[PDB]
Amino acid sequence: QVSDVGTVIQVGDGIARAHGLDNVMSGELVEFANGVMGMALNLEENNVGIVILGPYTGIKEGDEVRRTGRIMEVPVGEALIGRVVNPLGQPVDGLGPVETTETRPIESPAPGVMDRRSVHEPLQTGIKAIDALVPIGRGQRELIIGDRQTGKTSVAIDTIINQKDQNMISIYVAIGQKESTVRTVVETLRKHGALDYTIVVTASASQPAPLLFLAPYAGVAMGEYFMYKGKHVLVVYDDLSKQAAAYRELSLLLRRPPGREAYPGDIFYLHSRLLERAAKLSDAKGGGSLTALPFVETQAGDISAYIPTNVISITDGQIFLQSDLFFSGVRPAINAGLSVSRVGGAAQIKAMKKVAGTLRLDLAAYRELEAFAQFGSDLDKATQAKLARGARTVEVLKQDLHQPIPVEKQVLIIYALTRGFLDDIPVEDVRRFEKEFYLFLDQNGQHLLEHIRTTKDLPNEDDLNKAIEAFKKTFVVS
């Protein structure tokens, strides 16, 4: 046996200084006497700054550090599907080891400008508001932002669950969470049956800050292994603010000078590196894709903060969740005024596009008109009609929890709303109207659903009108 060996100088707070290691590479893996792995970041002239990836209570000054000759790497393979695992690829669910056979570097270049193809296929989330106002396509990255206790985790769970039929792999990465919460999420996924095609990566709050800093990179490294083979991957970063805090702590412990709010200057570079790997590969690359839904947790709904703006400038679109809308009865509380999707239209099927291209703009205009016209009772006929239509649309967009809806029914209900067939139902009855409409479509007009599912286009408009009128005749106002 032979290996370059260093010796430790300082230990504390998960950071170690070592002497020696002449031929250590930047960003390499090292292991101490206990077998705890470590990462080398600062290659100073006299010493090397080592970042510890485990419990450092067993490391004492004077111990020996052994080089390993490998960059940071994580195991990959189909054997990870249906498992809960550390960022290092070590299982925690206690169901035995994972029989992986290859690894991928955790720091890899993103696909270039000549490798990608424009996003052109949809990602159905089963949520009416998201699928109608801010559509998401495969290869797009969409940010979910809001205050605590608003519905971000529930939205992500519903999105993952709805992918049961499509040939898509899901990856859920929990950063800085609580272990009981992670177990609860895993249990819900298992109950609804989504564990057959998903991987859970967890780095709880008890873990040292380096593992929290590395977890999203491990998740995206696991995802892109499937991406480059022609699969389709969905990745959910449970909180990037936690990663930012962990990185700030690590940098401050390494004595790097701080910037705004004690953050290191390279936080934007960190997030850009993490999020730029999502792509829609061209046909020469196999056509695989990887879509990402990072999370950001604000304070008091201040969307104009440092980390929120930094993340917003990187992603394609944002879904903004509002506490005021949440507590006023509007759930999932999508604030369509601030939400936007930069890939709209191209990420919707033909029928959905031609039915709801203008819905977001009309809803924003209705919000502004409701804000203004509240200041006076002498209202015009057009304003009254617009207010009624806006109220009915807002009532339509409400949705319960764990109730996914097929797009072939979303398009039908939104068509019925936008063509004026809902103009006479009282605002309090729209939910029951939609329930009865789905029940009636489950028996009559099944050929409409078949045609929509097959051709991805609206059926003959006469049949739509006939079916809607037939349902309205048997519909009775409460």
Next chain:
Amino acid sequence: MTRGRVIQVMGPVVDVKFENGHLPAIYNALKIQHKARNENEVDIDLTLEVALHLGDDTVRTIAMASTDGLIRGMEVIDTGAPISVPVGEVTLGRVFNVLGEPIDLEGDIPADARRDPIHRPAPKFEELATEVEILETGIKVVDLLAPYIKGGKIGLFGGAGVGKTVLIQELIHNIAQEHGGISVFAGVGERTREGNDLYHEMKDSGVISKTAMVFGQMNEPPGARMRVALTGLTMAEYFRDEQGQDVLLFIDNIFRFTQAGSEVSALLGRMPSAVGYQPTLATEMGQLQERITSTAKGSITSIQAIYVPADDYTDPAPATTFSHLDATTNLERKLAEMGIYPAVDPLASTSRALAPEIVGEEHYQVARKVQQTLQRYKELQDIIAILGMDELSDEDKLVVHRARRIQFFLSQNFHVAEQFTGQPGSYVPVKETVRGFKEILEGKYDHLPEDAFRLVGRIEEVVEKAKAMGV
């Protein structure tokens, strides 16, 4: 023999230099004993906790007591183990300090009693439990809008003088008497007056002989305040694991733990964080919080008070701890000054347990309607403050008319507060409070004055108070 030597003394931080090849491990405990050699010295009996390895066989430690009288070059003895605290049936009915020494004047603990190290890794993923069920407390707002979870973590946020201590005392009165398991109280950075009052109250009520108490108070240096909570936690973990018994953990003002950490961190050589806090704020909190969990062997339900500096809920210490809790109640100074107690914020307070299948459809609908009306009333406040009621539409008039009554009915008269106002106080069940709120929402009491809804329970008391007032 392996012995040290004091090099530097900087407040609560002491440096020890050891003979080569015998450095103690991190979190070990070092002992300093020194008889005065002459009249220019004082006797010293003190203990230290290792925190860092600086190099050149030098170790940086944190003292658990005042460092006055330390002399450079004094001799330090190592123990080779972390701080150890007695556990078992011995600890029931006693009062301890951070070092595990009893202070109740009831005697001393035998030297052969089993004791366990304070520091240990958190429970693993496969050991945790997930069952959720409601813990009835008898407080209207808690039982309606944010039910408490049996076996979970509960947090109480509030500024200075808002009611956290009174709320905890009411919870102790309403739960600990009938709990039947084991209780432990760990006061951290609180008044010794309050500690003594609580001890005497428990002795009078007889709750002692099934409870243990640990006290690190305001007068202690930051070293003791950083570890008193861990001492209480390692006492509770024994009852959780080795006996499989239900454990009830009360922690008073857990914010002092992170405050003491921040105070110490400056002298350790760390650079300041955003608001002067330590860089390790998240990990230090997580290491403590992750051990308070319910496993398959047993369950711990923990109630923690959390202080909020300068009423700023965006402060990093309150902000980071929101992710470690299951049900939170946020007290508000605006409500406290208005005269409504316990001044719980009805919209900011959240709970994982408020689900239709956990509390029932009627409960869920009533809670949602109450929250909706309160949100609308909160929206109307800016216009109300200028133009008053006289410009509102007919619907908004009714919204305000009902929101005032709902808000007032959310208050209650606690048993503990009987010493402040003389009113006996009351205990209300979940079904009763749900029925009362449903009746109010249906409009069955719009003819009563709003002052009749204040500081009463069971709605029949509202009716009786209105009749007494002459309605």
Next chain:
Amino acid sequence: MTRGRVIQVMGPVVDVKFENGHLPAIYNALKIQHKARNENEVDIDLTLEVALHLGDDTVRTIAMASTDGLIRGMEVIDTGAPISVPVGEVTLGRVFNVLGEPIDLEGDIPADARRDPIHRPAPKFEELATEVEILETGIKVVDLLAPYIKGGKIGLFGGAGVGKTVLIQELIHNIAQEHGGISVFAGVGERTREGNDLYHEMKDSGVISKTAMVFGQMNEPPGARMRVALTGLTMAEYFRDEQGQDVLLFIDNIFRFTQAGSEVSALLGRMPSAVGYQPTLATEMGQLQERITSTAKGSITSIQAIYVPADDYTDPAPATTFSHLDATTNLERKLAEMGIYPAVDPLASTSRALAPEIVGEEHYQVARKVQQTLQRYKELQDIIAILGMDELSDEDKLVVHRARRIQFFLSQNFHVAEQFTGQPGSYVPVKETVRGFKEILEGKYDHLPEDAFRLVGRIEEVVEKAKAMGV
């Protein structure tokens, strides 16, 4: 020959020690071309740029790619000249990275092609030009309020997600089709998806035959993000100087340049400035902006998108970059939330060509009347919200009613925005814009519904939409 070696590696900053007798000049390009001697090494082909002279024959440099795999002691070759990129007609129809290497998979540039250094002093005072000409764009708000100047510098301010990229794509589609000259695009720190979409749009339109592109695209390190813009600038400067062409220069998110500078400043060792930026912010920005001018040899007109952090125009970067522009358009989120695009602020946007002798007296009068009506409307927005619309005077009701029409008519349907709008898009001349706005001001269309004026184009489209709505 003489070589250096690597001393320190700190992220994107590398220390190199050179033998005595030869120190590379500042901004010289260094090379690292190491090969793996054994299994435990990885091949590296990396280039460096000199930044400082630290003393003792040591140089502080900045890397152009990831430094992973670097080993202390690797050999560094000095090239004796700054980074040089090919210029001329070879560049047309190609896509380059920072180092001038093609990435379009169309074949490598011949080794004998002419190359020019990136860094060069700015043009003298006596070489500049002074004439002003209006550049018609086809956008109503831009053509009316803040006209663009041919051969001048134009900036598109705005926050995140407000419309800068869409507006610049619309401008490209409007003017580059028939510009009749050379065009250059510089992708500084943007989304690779946007870059690919733009490249394929140009490939479809056929404009790619007369334009050249460079991309940094937000994932390359700050070393490359601080030089891609200068690479594009020298590519355009060759055409301006040696051929006297008329050049369009499009730079996306010039703010990324100063952002990367701030990222690398602390590691370079400079003291921090006010908001965390580098002290050399103003001079670094000036040494780049001053090179983009129009001289007697030729004229370059540049359109630059400037990102405003946190929607705050008082941030140092926008504050200092305002002084370098002739005509500016300010985008704000308030108009974006109302659903009107391109959401150009009709107040903050200014142009130095807005003079009676340049655009016409009637044009100036219409612009001033529109601006004063909108300013008057902006002042009533506060009192209206809590005093109602009725309490205003009759004339103020009229100005509000007409200002709503003006504000809604300032929007336009873009060809590029077809995905987001479902409409083909329209192009409208200055004469139509001014005549329509004059008519709206004079009140010829007070009867038409408010909702009919948005995303239309001409007043003929306004009246047709109103008629189709049933009026």
